[PDB]
Structure formats: structure tokens, C-alpha cells
């Protein structure tokens, strides 16, 4: 088995896996909508409850499964629960990533394609201080780089330099991919964050310096860090932070599981985890949440920055920030560092949700990483094509994979290794090797908290708003669900010639 | 390796491979749109130059594989061409025929419900001669079945029985074939096709003796075999006419060479061969070809009967043939009749086009039967969602599969097993065994002929008409684009796995 060669790029390559566009993009945006600093406290109880426990139930079955020669959850839920359903079920530790790498490269590439817009000037001039005048030039680039539908058809024209750019981008996610754990994953890391922490940082004080005469940074601030105990009533609010939670630290999506097993059988995973887990809490509140919704507000106030975020997923980060950068000298490379930063934290997040079916194909199916990857990089290009042309099949694919599916997964992995393989060897099994013991407390919420606080979210989400989307949406969802579901018989398709390879010696 | 038990059971098989819906529903529609006898001498020379010996090369090269354990052409190819591209070719063979099942087996499960309701008398009474108050309870009878668009949206809504008969004939294709060849197939066919001709004759002779005001059954005849040298210029008529042959006598589907790869290494192909392929003409144009056109032709004259044939690939056998019956005593009986004879040619048919998937399972993968079986039904279950759901998808499969990809795969296996392996190898190989010989002119028909007429009219394909199909259609037509060009690369990747298994021994 590859193992990570070092401690710091153990902890590099799995800060990188969770700090991504969910930090930059996704928090800012749920983080307005919900209310600012009403969205906070249920945030911060969604870590302490769901994020640290599961982070460390995750890496515990990964580097278990990896001392005995598998990384991923077909095998690992079978070798913790020896029942042929377990294999099924664990086909969604191999489909969930899959199927989220295939809207999050394609939006990675658009971070790259604007990166490259922006280095090099073709951007729009908004005119020489009406907000629309502004922030139009902008959503129109957005919008012909990407095709969205102008007419009746749920049809997408994506310029064809983002169709290059989706390509180069898989081709890069390749070579890193292809060079493996410790020469590509973990070298790639080293590099990748230090400079994406640093330019975060230099974008963070560049937005403290905003002001106008609608307001500061610091009104985003206080907004944003500022309490409102109304809110903590709203299931709404809790949903929204529990599912960043699970995003945001990659919980839910097979990928924390495979990187965990290339941890060697000793090597500790209790502090490892905790700081993979706080570097990406920082970079989260800290710095995503200090770009954003800080430039937003001081720009248009706080009414007008919450009604933007609840606009779209895409007009804070991708149109407003920049119509902003806009208005300010040298706004044009502040957008080019912006996107660079959203590229970069992409790129060490979807290289993540790649090595699943790396691993799989590798660890299951025995081709070498070489074949693995390419075939991994094919079918995710290839089914890119339904994300890149058919109006809101990213958004279907992001409710299926990257929202109920992931808080779906969170409580079936956390079943099968702390109430059927057993919570007291799962307990054992997270602290072995620990540099510091997990908080005996966490044994309770491990076994106790964490799995009714997830199974009552999930019956309120099934309830009051999965009946919408299966009878408030366009027709066309049914090509998405009919392809995702798809490959899920594809992967179990797999997970059966594996089974028979196996048996063949 | 399985092998045929009989030689009746072998040419049976084989007759019930190619004698299925092309002869009594596609025959005659594809000859009243071509000017009835102006279309009969391209077929009887397309047949003569184009479907026997074609037919003598798949059997060859099946027989060829099984004796080497390889019943399909990415093996096959390979074998007569040790080149990896032979490989790739050698997955249309695969995935022809696996198309063609998602939409064939749908249209086999309306025959089915039809001869269900028709035997039940659930079915329209039209009132006690207006032609549109007889046609229109039976057009809406078709149309409620599958749900044909009422709206603007290309959205199918079959009826629930519909969607139940389709899982009752899957049911029905896999009680066959999960038995195998001489228990399965081969018993199945002994049963199968005396009781199609049986039923066919009965239904000429009914036939036979309608006669209305506007003409009689033998006018419907003259139409069909009179000839119009006119129309001996016409290029579409000679593409009309050779896919027509190909889709009749199952050429370029890989269904010929399968079954071929279960006759023993020693065993007759020529003779076998051609009477299989004298059978499935006989029954086209004497059964087939005396049914449907003679009937429509009594009942409303040539000029009505041709713009029926026109309206519509289903008008002629679902629509106006029950419509007519319907004026009849017995009427419904005869259409049940009419329609059991559908639903036995279809499925004798049907199983033959999944039987290529199952045997590369089989023989490339290792897979039992039973689950070669199972895993070949689910997929083409699955897929025919698509079918059975988007309109016009059907249409869409059938072209690049049934129509062009068909011709295409024809050639090439031309070009591999007469070309490139050798036609002196090719040539002994056909006729090794042979109870009778090859005429020797076909030797140079194989060689010369035959690859010139099949290249010349898919270079005329290309150039007229396949231009239309990419720009004149509906944007839907990409979803099934995409989804079946995915099929091909899954299949690439089975060939991929099968390549692996291999060398790991
Ligand atoms: C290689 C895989 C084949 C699948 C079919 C996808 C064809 C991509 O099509 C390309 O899309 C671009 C973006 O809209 C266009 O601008 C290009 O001109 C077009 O050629
Ligand atoms: C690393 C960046 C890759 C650049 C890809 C080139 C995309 C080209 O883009 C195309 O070509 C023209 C360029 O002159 C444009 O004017 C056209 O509108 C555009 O369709
Ligand atoms: C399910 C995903 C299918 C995507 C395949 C779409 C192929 C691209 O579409 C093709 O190229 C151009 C680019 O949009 C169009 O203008 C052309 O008319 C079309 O043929
Ligand atoms: C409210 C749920 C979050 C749990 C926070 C736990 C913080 C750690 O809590 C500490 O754990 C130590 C190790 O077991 C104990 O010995 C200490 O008494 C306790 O303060
Ligand atoms: C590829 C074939 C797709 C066509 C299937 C459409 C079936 C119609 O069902 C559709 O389901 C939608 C999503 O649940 C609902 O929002 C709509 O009410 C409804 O039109
Ligand atoms: C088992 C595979 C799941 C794929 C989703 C297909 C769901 C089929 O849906 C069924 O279609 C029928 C025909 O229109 C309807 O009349 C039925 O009421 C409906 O339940
Ligand atoms: C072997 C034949 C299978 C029969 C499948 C039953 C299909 C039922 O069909 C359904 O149920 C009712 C029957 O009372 C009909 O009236 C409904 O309209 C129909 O949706
Ligand atoms: C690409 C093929 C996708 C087919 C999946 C369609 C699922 C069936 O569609 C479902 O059931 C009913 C039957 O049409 C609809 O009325 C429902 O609103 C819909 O949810
Ligand atoms: C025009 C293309 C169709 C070919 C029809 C060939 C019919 C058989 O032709 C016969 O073949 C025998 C065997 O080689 C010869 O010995 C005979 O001379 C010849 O009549
Ligand atoms: C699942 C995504 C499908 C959307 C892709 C539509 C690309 C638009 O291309 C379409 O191609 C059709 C077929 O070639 C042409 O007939 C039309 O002119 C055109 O609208
Ligand atoms: S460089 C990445 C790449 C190129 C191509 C051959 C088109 N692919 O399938 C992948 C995604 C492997
Ligand atoms: S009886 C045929 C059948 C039933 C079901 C389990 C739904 N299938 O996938 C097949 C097509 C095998
Ligand atoms: C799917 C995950 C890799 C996403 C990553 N945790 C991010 O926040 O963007
Ligand atoms: C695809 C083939 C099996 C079709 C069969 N030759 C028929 O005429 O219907
Ligand atoms: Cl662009
Ligand atoms: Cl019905
Ligand atoms: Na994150
Ligand atoms: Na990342
Ligand atoms: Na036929
Ligand atoms: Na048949």
C-alpha cells in the first residue's frame, strides 16, 4: 500500500481536501441566507456534534480498512459488518464522490477559466455608480461563459474557452492524481496551501480596507458574527448548517475514509483529524467568511448583500465580488487572485473526491493507478457533459450526492461502525496510536447524540421539502436522476466483479 | 462450451434470430413507402449480394470464436486481427445488439399487452364507415398505451399495464435464456416458430378472402410484387432496401455470430446458414408481406394504404390492422391472433439480441450464466427507461444502432474476416464442414462486391441524409446520444477488465 510520507503533508493533503470551494463559495452564501450570525450558533453546534465525531469516525475506518489493503467503503463496510448488504451500501461512499466530482471540477474549471480572464484583461468595464450598471457587465459574462438558457429550453451553450478550460482542468487534476498518495496528492499540498492561505489572507485585508458610503467591512462583520437567538427555533437554519458542515469537511463523501487509508496502521489519527478538521473551521470563518459577505455588505449594505446571497449560488463569488473588485484600483488582479484562490482550493478538494474510485479500482479490481485514474478521469469528463448542458443538473446532482446523500451516508457509516461493528471496538479503534485520547464524552455523543440528532434532521428534510423537489421541479431532473441512478447500478455493478475476482483465487 | 443439441434445433434457433418484428411490421412498411414492387428488386439483389453472404461470414466467424471460447467480436476481431484497435471495433458487437434490445424489447412488450387486452376484448369498439371514426378509437388506443404526447413537452406517459407487460416480457426474455442454449433458446424455438408459421398462415388466409368496395387482398398483392423500373434509380430505395436486409436477417448485430460460436468446430454452416436465411425470407415476403399491405390495401386502396404505411413506423400493424380486423367477425380474436404472432416473432428475436452480452459475460468475465443473465436484463431494463419515457428516443436508438451502425458493422467485419485476416482463410473457413459449398462466384461477391456496394451506400448515408438527423431534430435527441454513446464506453471498459483478467493468469 502507498502511504503519506510525512505528518505535515498527511495533514496538508487532508486540510486540502476539506478547504475548497465550500469555504469561499458555499459558506458565505448559506451563512447570509440563514440569517448571519443566527446561521452561527447552530454551525458551531453542528462541529462540536457532527463534524469532529464524525471526522474522527472516518479516518478511524479508513485507516483500518487500509491496513488490511482497502480504502474504500464497499470493502470497509463489509470488513466492519460481514453482510452483503453492507457492500451495497457502501457503493455510496464510491458514488457520492463520483458524482459530485462531476459539478464541482466543471465549477473548479470555471474558477480557473475566470483566473485566466482576469490575469490577462478581458473582463467587462462596468461605466464610469447605478448597482445594475455595475454588477450587469458581470452577470452577463458569467452568463455566456457558462450558457445559461436564454430563451424556453433548459439548454446550456457554455462558451467554448470554458469547454477547454473544464479539459485542462481535468488534465491537471490528472497529473496530479496519476502521480499518486505521496509524490502527487501530498507533494501537491505543500504547495498548494501555504499559498492559499496566503492569498486569503492578503484578500481578507484587502476587503477589511473597503468603504463606502453604504457601509465597511466591518458592518459584514458584525453581521455575520452577530447573534440572533430568534433563529435558533427555525429547522430551516439547522438543516442549512448541518449540511455545511458535512460539505465543508468533506464528511459524508468516502473521501476523508480513502485518504485515511494511507495512514500507516500506527500512525495517530485522534490529533491528526481534530487539526485537518480546525485548519478547515478556520479557513472557513476566518477567511471565507471575512471576503465575501464583508466586501458585499460594505458595498450595498447589509439588505442588499443578504439579497444577493439568496439570488443564486454563484452571484456573490463569481459576479458580485468581482463587479466589486471592479470599482477599485488594480480590481482586475484582486479578481485574478480571487480566482486563483477558488481554483486552487478547489483543485486539492476534487483530487480528493477522485481517489475513491482510484482507490477502488486499484485496491478491488487491481489496475494499476496509472488505468485507474485515467478511467476514473474519463467517466468523470464524460458524464460532465449532462452538468455542462442541461440547465440545473448540477443543482440535482448537488441535492442528490452532495446534500441529503452525504447526511445519508454520515449516519449509515456511523451505524455500521459505532452500533454493528461495535462502539467500544470502534472506540478503540479511533484512539489506537493516538497522540491524545479522544474526550470520553465524544464516546456519548458518538454512540448516543450524533446519530438521533442526524436521523431527526433527515426525517424533517424527507418531510417538509424532498416532496417540492420530486413535485416542484422541471421535467428534465428526471435525466439526471435517471443517469446518477445509473451509475450507482454501474458501482454496484463493479463491486460484484470484484466480488468475483476475489472468489477466482 | 454450449452447443446446439440438434440441427432442426440449431436452423429453428437461428430462423427465430431473424424471423421477428422486421418481417411483419418494418417489411412491410419499408416496401409501401418504396413503391410496393419498385422496392422488391433492390431487396431481392441486396439479399442476393449483401444478406447471404454476409450471413455465411457471421455464422463463420462464430463458429470460428466458439471453438476458441469466444463468442463475440471483441474477442473475435481480435483473433482474426491480434491489433487492441480490433478490440474496440469488435464493442459494436456488443453494444448493437444490447441498443437495439432496449427499444426492441419494448416494442415486443406491446405486443404482448395488445394480444392481452385483444384476447380480454378490452379494446375499442368502433361505431356500427367513416374511415377517421373507425382509425381514431385504435390510434388512441396506441397512443394512450405508450402515452404519446397530448402537449409540447417530448415527455412519454405510457399506461401503467404497458409498464407492467414490459417487466413481464423482460421476466419472460429471462425465464429463456437463463436455461442456455439447447435448454433455453433451442428448446424455446422448437415450440416458438412452428407455432408462427401456423398462426401467419392462418392469418394470410383471412386475409386473403377480405374484399370491401375499394378493393380486395389481391390487389394488395399486385401492389407488393409488381414491378417499377422507375424507382430502380432512386438511391433511397436501395437504402430502404439493403436495411432492410441487414435488419431482417439480424446482419451486423453480433446475434448471428453468437449463436454461431454454440455450433460445434465441425458442424455445417453453409447449408444450415442458408436455409436459416431462406427461412426469414420466405417468411417475410410470403407471410409477411401478405398480411398487413394486402389487407390495408382491401380496405382503402392503394393510394390510402401507402399514406398509412407513410404516417407512421406503428400505424400500419397497431393502429389499422386491428381497425380493420375490428370490421370483421371475430375481428378481436384475429387481432390477438395478430398480436401473439408479433409478440412470439419478437421474442424468439429478442433473445438473440442479449444473447451477445451474456455470452462476452460468460466467456470474457467468467460470469455464470444465471448472472450473465440477470446483469444483461437489468441493464437493458434499466435503459429502457429512456425508451419508454423521452419521446422520440426510440427513433434515435434504432438509427444508430439499427440503421447505420448495422451497415457500418457489417463492413467491417467484412474488412476483418475477409481483408485483413485473409479471404483464402476467410473462404476456407466458410466452407470447412460444409455439407454443400460455397458457390465459388460468392468468393469473389465476399471479396470485391459486396464491400464496395455496403461502402458506396454508407458514403451516400452520410452524405444526404445524416446531416438532417444531426440539425434538423429536437434537442432532446442528445440525451439518448449521450446516454448511448456511455453504453459504448462502459463496454469498452468491460473489454478493458476482460483484457486484465486475462493477463493476471
Ligand atoms: C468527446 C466527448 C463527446 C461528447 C459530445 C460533446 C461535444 C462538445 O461540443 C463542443 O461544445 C462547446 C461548448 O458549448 C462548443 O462551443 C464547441 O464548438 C463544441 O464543438
Ligand atoms: C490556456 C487557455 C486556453 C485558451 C483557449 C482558446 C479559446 C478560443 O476561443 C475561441 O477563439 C477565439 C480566439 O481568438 C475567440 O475570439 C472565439 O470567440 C472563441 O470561440
Ligand atoms: C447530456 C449531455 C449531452 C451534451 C452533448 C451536446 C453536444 C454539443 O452540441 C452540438 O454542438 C454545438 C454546441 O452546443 C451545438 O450548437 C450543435 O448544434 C450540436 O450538434
Ligand atoms: C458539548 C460537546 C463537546 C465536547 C467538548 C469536550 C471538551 C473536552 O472536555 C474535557 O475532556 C477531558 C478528556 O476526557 C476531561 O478529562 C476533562 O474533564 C474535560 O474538560
Ligand atoms: C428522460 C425521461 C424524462 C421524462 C420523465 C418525466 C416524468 C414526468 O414527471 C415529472 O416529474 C418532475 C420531477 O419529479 C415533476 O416536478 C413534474 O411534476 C413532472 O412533470
Ligand atoms: C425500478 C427502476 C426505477 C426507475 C424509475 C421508473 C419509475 C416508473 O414509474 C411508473 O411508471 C408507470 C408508467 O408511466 C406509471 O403509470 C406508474 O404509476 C409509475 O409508478
Ligand atoms: C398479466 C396482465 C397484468 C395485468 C396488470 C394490471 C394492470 C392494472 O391497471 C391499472 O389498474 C386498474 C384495473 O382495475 C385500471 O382500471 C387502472 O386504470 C390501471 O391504472
Ligand atoms: C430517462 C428516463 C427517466 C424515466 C423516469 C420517470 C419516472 C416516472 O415519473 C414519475 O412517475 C409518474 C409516471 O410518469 C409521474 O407522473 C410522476 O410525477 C413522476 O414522479
Ligand atoms: C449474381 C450473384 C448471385 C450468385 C448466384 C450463384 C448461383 C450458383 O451458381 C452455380 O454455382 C455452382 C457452384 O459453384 C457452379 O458450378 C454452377 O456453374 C453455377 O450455376
Ligand atoms: C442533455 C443535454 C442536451 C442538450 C444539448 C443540445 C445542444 C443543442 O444542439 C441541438 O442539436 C440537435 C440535434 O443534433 C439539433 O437538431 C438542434 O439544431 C440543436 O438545438
Ligand atoms: S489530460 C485528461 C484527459 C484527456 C482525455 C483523453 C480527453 N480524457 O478522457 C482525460 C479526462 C483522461
Ligand atoms: S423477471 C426479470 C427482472 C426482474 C427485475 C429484478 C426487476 N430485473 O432487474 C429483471 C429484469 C432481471
Ligand atoms: C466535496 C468536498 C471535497 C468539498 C470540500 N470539503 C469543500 O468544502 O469545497
Ligand atoms: C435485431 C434483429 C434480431 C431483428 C430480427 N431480424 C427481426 O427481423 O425483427
Ligand atoms: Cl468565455
Ligand atoms: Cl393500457
Ligand atoms: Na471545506
Ligand atoms: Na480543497
Ligand atoms: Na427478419
Ligand atoms: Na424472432
Known amino acids: 500500500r502507498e502511504h503519506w510520507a510525512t505528518r505535515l503533508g498527511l495533514i496538508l493533503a487532508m486540510a486540502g481536501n476539506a478547504v ?12 447570509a441566507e440563514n440569517g448571519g450570525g ?17 471526522m474522527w469516525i472516518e479516518w478511524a475506518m479508513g485507516r483500518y480498512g487500509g491496513a488490511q489493503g482497502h480504502g474504500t467503503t464497499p470493502a470497509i463496510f463489509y470488513l466492519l459488518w460481514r453482510n452483503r448488504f453492507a457492500k451495497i451500501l457502501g457503493v455510496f461512499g464510491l458514488w457520492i464522490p463520483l458524482v459530485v466530482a462531476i459539478y464541482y471540477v466543471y465549477i473548479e474549471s470555471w474558477t480557473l477559466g475566470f483566473a485566466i ?62 502521480r499518486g498518495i505521496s509524490k502527487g496528492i501530498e507533494r501537491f499540498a505543500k504547495i498548494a496551501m501555504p499559498t492559499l492561505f496566503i492569498l486569503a489572507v492578503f484578500l481578507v485585508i484587502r476587503v477589511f480596507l473597503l468603504e463606502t458610503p453604504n457601509g465597511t467591512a466591518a458592518d459584514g462583520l458584525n453581521f455575520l458574527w452577530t447573534p440572533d437567538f430568534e433563529k435558533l427555533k427555525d429547522p430551516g437554519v439547522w438543516i442549512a448548517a448541518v449540511g455545511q458542515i458535512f460539505f465543508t469537511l468533506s464528511l459524508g463523501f468516502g473521501a476523508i475514509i480513502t485518504y485515511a487509508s494511507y495512514v500507516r496502521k500506527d500512525q495517530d489519527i485522534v490529533l491528526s483529524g481534530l487539526t485537518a478538521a480546525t485548519l478547515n473551521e478556520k479557513a472557513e470563518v476566518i477567511l471565507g467568511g471575512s471576503i465575501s459577505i464583508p466586501a458585499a455588505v460594505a458595498f450595498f449594505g447589509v439588505a442588499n448583500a443578504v439579497a444577493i446571497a439568496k439570488a443564486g449560488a454563484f452571484n456573490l463569488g463569481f459576479i458580485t465580488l468581482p463587479a466589486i473588485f471592479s470599482q477599485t484600483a488594480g480590481g482586475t488582479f484582486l479578481g485574478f487572485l480571487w480566482f486563483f484562490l477558488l481554483f486552487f482550493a478547489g483543485l486539492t478538494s476534487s483530487i480528493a473526491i477522485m481517489q475513491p474510485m482510484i482507490a477502488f479500482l486499484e485496491d478491488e479490481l487491481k489496475l494499476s493507478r496509472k488505468h485507474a485514474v485515467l478511467w476514473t478521469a474519463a467517466i468523470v469528463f464524460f458524464s460532465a457533459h449532462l452538468v455542462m448542458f442541461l440547465n440545473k443538473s448540477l443543482d440535482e446532482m448537488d441535492f442528490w450526492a452532495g446534500t441529503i446523500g452525504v447526511v445519508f451516508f ?22 489506537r496510536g493516538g497522540i491524545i485520547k479522544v474526550p470520553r464524552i465524544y464516546y456519548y455523543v458518538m454512540r448516543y447524540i450524533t446519530p438521533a440528532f442526524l436521523a431527526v434532521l433527515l426525517v424533517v428534510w424527507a418531510r417538509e421539502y424532498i416532496p417540492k423537489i420530486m413535485e416542484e421541479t422541471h421535467w428534465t431532473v428526471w435525466i439526471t436522476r435517471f443517469y446518477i441512478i445509473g451509475l450507482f447500478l454501474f458501482l454496484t455493478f463493479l463491486v460484484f466483479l470484484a466480488e468475483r475476482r476475489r472468489n477466482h483465487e
Not at 21 to 29: A, E, K, S, Y
Not at 126 to 137: H, Q
Open 410 to 431: 454520515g449516519l449509515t457509516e456511523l451505524i455500521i461502525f459505532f452500533w454493528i461493528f461495535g462502539a467500544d471496538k470502534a472506540w478503540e479503534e479511533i484512539n
Open 38 to 54: 443566527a446561521f452561527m450558533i447552530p454551525y458551531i453546534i453542528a462541529f462540536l456534534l457532527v463534524g469532529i465525531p464524525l
Open 117 to 178: 480572464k482576469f490575469l490577462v484583461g478581458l473582463v467587462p468595464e462596468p461605466p464610469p455608480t447605478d448597482p445594475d450598471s455595475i454588477l450587469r457587465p458581470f452577470k452577463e459574462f458569467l452568463y455566456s461563459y457558462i450558457g445559461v438558457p436564454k430563451g424556453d429550453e433548459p439548454i446550456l451553450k457554455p462558451s467554448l474557452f470554458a469547454y477547454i478550460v473544464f479539459l485542462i482542468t481535468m488534465c491537471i487534476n490528472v497529473s496530479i492524481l496519476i
Open 20 to 31: 475548497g470551494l465550500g469555504n469561499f463559495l458555499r459558506f458565505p452564501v448559506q451563512a
